[PDB]
Amino acid sequence: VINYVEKAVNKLTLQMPYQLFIGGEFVDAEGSKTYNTINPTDGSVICQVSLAQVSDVDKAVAAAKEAFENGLWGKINARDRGRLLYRLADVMEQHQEELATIEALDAGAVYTLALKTHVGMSIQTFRYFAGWCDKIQGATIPINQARPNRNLTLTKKEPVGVCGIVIPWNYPLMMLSWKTAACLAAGNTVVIKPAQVTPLTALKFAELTLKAGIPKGVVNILPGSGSLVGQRLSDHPDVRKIGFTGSTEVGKHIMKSCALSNVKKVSLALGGKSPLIIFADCDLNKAVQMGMSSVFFNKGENAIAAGRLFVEESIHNQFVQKVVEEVEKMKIGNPLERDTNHGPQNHEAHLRKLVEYCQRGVKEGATLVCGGNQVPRPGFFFQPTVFTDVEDHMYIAKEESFGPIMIISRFADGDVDAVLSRANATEFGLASGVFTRDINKALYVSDKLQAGTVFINTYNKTDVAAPFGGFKQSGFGKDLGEAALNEYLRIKTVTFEY
Amino acid sequence: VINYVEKAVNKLTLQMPYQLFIGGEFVDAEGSKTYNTINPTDGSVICQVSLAQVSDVDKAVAAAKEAFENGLWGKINARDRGRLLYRLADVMEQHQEELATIEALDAGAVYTLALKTHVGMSIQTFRYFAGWCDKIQGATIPINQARPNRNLTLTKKEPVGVCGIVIPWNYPLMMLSWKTAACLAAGNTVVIKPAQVTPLTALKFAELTLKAGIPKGVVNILPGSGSLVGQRLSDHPDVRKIGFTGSTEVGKHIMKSCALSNVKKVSLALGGKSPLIIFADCDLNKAVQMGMSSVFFNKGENAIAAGRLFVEESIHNQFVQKVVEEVEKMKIGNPLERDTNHGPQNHEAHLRKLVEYCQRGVKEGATLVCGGNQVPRPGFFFQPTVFTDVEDHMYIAKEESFGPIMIISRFADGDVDAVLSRANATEFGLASGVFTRDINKALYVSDKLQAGTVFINTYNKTDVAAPFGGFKQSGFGKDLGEAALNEYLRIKTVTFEY
Amino acid sequence: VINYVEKAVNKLTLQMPYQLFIGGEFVDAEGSKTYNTINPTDGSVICQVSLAQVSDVDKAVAAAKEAFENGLWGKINARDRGRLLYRLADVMEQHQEELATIEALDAGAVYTLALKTHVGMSIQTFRYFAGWCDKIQGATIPINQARPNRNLTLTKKEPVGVCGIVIPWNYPLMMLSWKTAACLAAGNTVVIKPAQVTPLTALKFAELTLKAGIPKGVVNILPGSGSLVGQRLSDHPDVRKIGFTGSTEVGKHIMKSCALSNVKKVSLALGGKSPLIIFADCDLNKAVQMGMSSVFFNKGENAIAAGRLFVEESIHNQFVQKVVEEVEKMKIGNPLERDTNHGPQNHEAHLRKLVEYCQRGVKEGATLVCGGNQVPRPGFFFQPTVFTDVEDHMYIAKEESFGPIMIISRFADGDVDAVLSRANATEFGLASGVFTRDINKALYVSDKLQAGTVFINTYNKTDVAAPFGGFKQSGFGKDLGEAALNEYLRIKTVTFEY
Amino acid sequence: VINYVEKAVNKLTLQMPYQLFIGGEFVDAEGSKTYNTINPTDGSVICQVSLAQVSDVDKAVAAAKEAFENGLWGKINARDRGRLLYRLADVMEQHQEELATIEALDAGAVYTLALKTHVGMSIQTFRYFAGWCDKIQGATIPINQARPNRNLTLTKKEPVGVCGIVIPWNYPLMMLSWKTAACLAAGNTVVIKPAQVTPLTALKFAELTLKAGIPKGVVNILPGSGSLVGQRLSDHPDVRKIGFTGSTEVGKHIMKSCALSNVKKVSLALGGKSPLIIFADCDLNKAVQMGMSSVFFNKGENAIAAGRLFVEESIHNQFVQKVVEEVEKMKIGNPLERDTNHGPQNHEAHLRKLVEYCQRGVKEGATLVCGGNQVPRPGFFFQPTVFTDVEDHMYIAKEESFGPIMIISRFADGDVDAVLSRANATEFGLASGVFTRDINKALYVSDKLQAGTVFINTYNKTDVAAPFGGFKQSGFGKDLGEAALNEYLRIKTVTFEY
């Protein structure tokens, strides 16, 4: 029997585990330490969650090590590993409303969006990677023969072993799922650190691994701080790979910690300041819809959000006019209400950062067309914001807001290379977009954009089969697609002479 | 007109550049600083070589950046890039006797071996990777469709950009070639730091890039110290990838430096303590020949060298007797003499370490069967060495010698899992081997060995098509084969809606 | 309401459809023509089954064409096609006992075996290929650029369209499933012709596609003759691909019919005379168990069955003695008896062929050690048979029996090339095997055997992930694994200039 | 010493072999039979060429078989096979002017074009496939384990063995090179049948294999008739694969012959009636240039030639006007004159077909705008032809001309699906094209076109890396790219239990 926080909400009964998950059981942290998790809709405490300590990290890693080296997970067929992951996806689907409701409470995710994305994409991710298990293949290689003898060379794709996953708060279940699904499909075991502010779907997911029959110790979950729990994971001599998602500055630190301990493998999914270039020959009404989505999707708490819009001179004023018209139509409110399409920011400190961000934009001389403030209601709601007359040297032209702030610059009619130069003038390189009906412009621009993803006449169109990762200081390694598996596999070369 | 150090040796007239190679020209370092490169056969100075300074690194990176962004290398077809690399291999082959002679002088490489391996494999490396240029392919991916609209998702494989390569001294030209060929095949430009003690084949290679018509700035070479030149390469804001080969401890520092600057990508080819397990049912005479090769090849200056031999009890004494017999037949001498089997160690500091290594092995109680000493002759020669009665707790059971020291332990008749545990009880995981006629043992042992390469009834059988890289603290990433290309490529995902 | 033949048997009430399945409906054939399907355990008529006519073939192809061109199957996401195929596998699993019982009745498959293989592997097949749907990918290719313009070249993997599948009677559901799963996973629609003698699991399968929600017309099944139904399929102008499994001689005719009509694509999975080479250094008792299995599995009605055993001279007589001892322990009887090891042959005409085959073997001078005749009891049971003193010129050394007849020749110790020559002296090339503890022999022999599959120290180890197909007159193309998809996909190259 | 036909022409002294090439030597055919090859510029006899007989085919196949089974080609490293093919390309490059001159004489190929395409692309083809030799790789596959035992499954890519190549006359050297390069790269040996009318570059190529060091019997060349030599190749019991390029009707017969003998593998590169759709929103001047090229390139003797142009109503009249203007500027003349841009048709029988084709076009009611006739001069020149008012029911809307005949229909402004339906209403499916600046339209049309290749805003943009093959009655299998190798390889699955 597991202890739950129980809550009647959204036409169901939530049963939320709140403890650490280690070796297939929910357990208190050392000293029974706890912290409060906060509902961004009203600022209330949802419940108390165990606060993992260093000794809890060591217990989690030891359980993962034992599960990998001696448990059933390391013994079963890849096909049967696949079956278990497909079953886990099924169990997640059976609990989809509950999961999406927890995400609405914990992260401020609009419930209808959470059902399709936060939860829906997580389910797709597990099903996708479950199909990879028995299709992960090595090679046989035609090497030079040591005549008069013969040689056979093959490669074997093997698991890396114990992995650590450290993730942010914007899509709590989805960020966990991207990495966890690829990690488990490759045959590894894992210790996961959700962002401290958003532990609840991670702990519910943990319970679901029990319902699915995932062997004890394969999945371990440690609500807690990066500076304590995350650090220890990065430092641990039995951890062999870290999958990290978060800010560029913490990514640098994580990579350093991997180096100094045991040169554990690392992937880094970091910040972005993604440019969206909108040409005059696009479909304008569609550009407004997609451009708004590129910024405002999930209250802007979206790594790939367009952090800069470049709009061709001749359509700029009309584009801005239409955006403002549509922004006024947005329904801001409780993420559980069906008419809501703009939920609260994830937590109070982030709301404060956004308010300060827009003050700097005003101070430095950008035109605040609308928004810029907290919405005067309970919780941590921020107004959908539009800036114009943004110049390349401005702070808001350079810094990632990670909020619902559309930051608009002009470019001269007929310019192409000039705007590309401006769009590429960043140490980030996560995503980018271009709206145009012109085939030649679209292909040329996608060639020249210095970013890991280029959207053409769309935005936010991610897919579990399509690899996702950045260039430059947005990091390296992929989530999603076949490419993601490579972060969680090692290649052993075997060479015979006969 | 290039300045050479001219030398008449080995029935050739060597013409050796000695300056920095920056932007397609040989130039002096800042302040015309130089250092001496030492011939390990007699301890004499070969010549003075330019000593790169920080401002020289900045010039080399600037030249590489220009070559990539604006030069011809970034504009030509993949097919034509391949043609240039195949021409480069042809030029290397035209100069093969000269290159092997330089390697004999600089590194102490036995000339006949340098023709086949140090230089021979370097030529094969460029030809192999030349073939990859127009065969590097992205993907088209069947993503979910945004109905009633359609989506197309593709990936493009692109160059990473400016790379730094930092290498050691054991196979100076070949270590350079592995990384350089894959790096250039993928369309990058490069700044190479050879090991300070072995700059000469790198500088001759530089001149050969001119003969082959590699555009200026594509290849740049900076003899100098790791703590100065290598450090700056790892720190540089315009460098996007470091390919590193060296010790585990420097690898840790390199990775930290990549992290702290601009999270540049990194590959780490580090140290080894590779186990070779020899069962009683092997071919004994072959096991002796291959066992000796596993240790003594290239005077033991071989990262994959077997650093422990485990020999089954019933054949142990006969194995040792036969090795001693064969060791006594080895001809130690000038690497340029055709009858030489065993050349000098690479440099004096390394010889000193090997002497100390064997002193400690005797101190801690291992049986010194033969060798262990500097050979009484000029230069830095070390006697092929055999230790027996080695126990798992001993320093020589744990520490990488990187010299010609065969380190032998017994295991009990029939004790497969037990010997495997002993073989795996190391934080290294570079290579390994097993000698047995039994198919079931061979396959089971190769599954269980925790190493990036497993040799079965052979050793030292590397091939330009077979990926090479370690596990655990032997690093990550691959040199050679198709896999090596992934270190020098980035994947861009392009998603259309239409 | 679907009409069923109802039967109380094996603790179940079987509900067996018996009509043609066209466009999602069970329908009588033209003129309500029918034929009898026979139970091989007692020779009784199970029921009457609709007998497809030419107009019925045209209706099925029209339904398949409409389903492909305009129906839902052609419009849904690859991922969603995958979901439907997974659901089909789940439905088959929910009905596995019923399917295995039907296969016992219709094909004489031993019930316990049919659960694991005839049905269990069919289920694995659908689940395996379900996972491929959203992982079928094309390429982007670095072609030469038409300067000063640019080029993008990509490939798209597309379905071939309407396919015809024609199969034999030995594993009715499994042969169906292998091809159908790959065919549908690739996005095609299909008309299936089961062997006339074994229509029943195919028709139950058809009903399961309805339960699974496979869109109407995607799957169509036409019990009937090869010379009428199969012929029309191969001739039909709207069929673009035939997947054929059967005899070499019918395969020749089928390929010709494809040629003469519309050059439709064809795969050919044909006969075998597979050699198993057993060396004196094998584990003898294991060689006996696996050698017996290589021949007697599924009453010899197994295309990959070892059709000759070459047994090394020094172990031959002991091998034969052990085989005879084990053959005598085999329980022959009703496929529903849970201790049955050997069921009846599939149908009466095959039994008669096997009696004649053995008369011919004795006549030409082979030694009949045991078996060779019909078991005196109702139905069509044939004794497990062993021949020795078989020589290379003999009819039974050349001709495929497709029955439980072990055909043994000696070979001399210390020649390997000589036994290979004898093993390779056939126009078949489907499978082969080698039993030896010697790694060098195993690897060399596997290199030299001229067969699409080589088993080493095992036999009949097929797997849904491992491609299966023959060489020479055993045909071409693969069932199973990733390679099977290529028979059901076409590649479109798309080249842009911009 | 080889017998040559010597010819002083194009400022060169041509040395043309004229005999059969069998087992590394030029020999007369059985009975010294010969036939005349005809210069299409003036209708004169170039020289007498040996006429291969059945016994000569048997000798070639025996030589290919011995070279494969016992000769050096079957023994050398894949890497060394690649070196030989690169060397072959180099020799071809050293002879490029001579080869292009021979092609001008034999096939009427315009010299400047033959240099770039006929010969230039043949060279690229051998270099490209030379690079594949040591990069052809099999797999290791994660199959279900027969617990308590373990299984390893791998695939080996092997050569198919002796191949027959049967080709047409439009690009004699290039068609040979496409197939021969892939065939040899995969490790096979080959007997080549050039079109009887164009044997000369094939025989010169044969001599170049000698210069390049290709082992005797690896390449064998038999000038002669399809009905005799081609037939025997398709019939031969030792040939295991036919690579065929030619008409759809001969393709059907070839496939039938493959079936009836030994089910040898076959690829079919057959005819085309490829549609080019030109929208009003294209760049009109570029559409005219590329539209011209799509029809007139290599005097229309181009399998992928656009056989229908569909031009949008609003630009149709202007397109036709501009085409007529450009057609009038074409210089018809001797292929060796530098100002010629339209050479003679390949041979007399083809010229006659083209005359009849245009007669039937006029008869059935199409508007003949220009050409349609043999040019009044010696040889077999044909006037570049333009037809308009072509309706879907007409012969020239359905039948492949394989000549310089532009066949134009209108489609209504704003129609897309309607014109696609018309473009797809053919049993051919080789190539196609679309000209439009609209990204949505270009992507949609490329999805919907039922053809193996789709060109977007270009035409005739083939590449050695880009796979090329048809759908429907245009055949199956690819030439060029990685995909081409699959036709010349077989996959062996090796499964161990241990």
Ligand SMILES: NC(=O)c1ccc[n+]([C@@H]2O[C@H](COP(=O)([O-])OP(=O)(O)OC[C@H]3O[C@@H](n4cnc5c(N)ncnc54)[C@H](OP(=O)(O)O)[C@@H]3O)[C@@H](O)[C@H]2O)c1
């Ligand atoms: N590229 C992508 O796929 C992607 C996706 C989502 C978000 N992001 C990026 O993430 C950022 C937003 O999240 P954030 O600013 O909250 O990120 P953050 O501060 O970098 O935190 C990310 C995670 O790192 C942990 N952490 C902090 N210090 C650590 C340490 N010393 N050792 C180990 N772990 C440590 C944090 O723990 P705490 O819970 O204690 O903070 C948290 O779990 C944005 O820049 C956004 O673009 C990127």
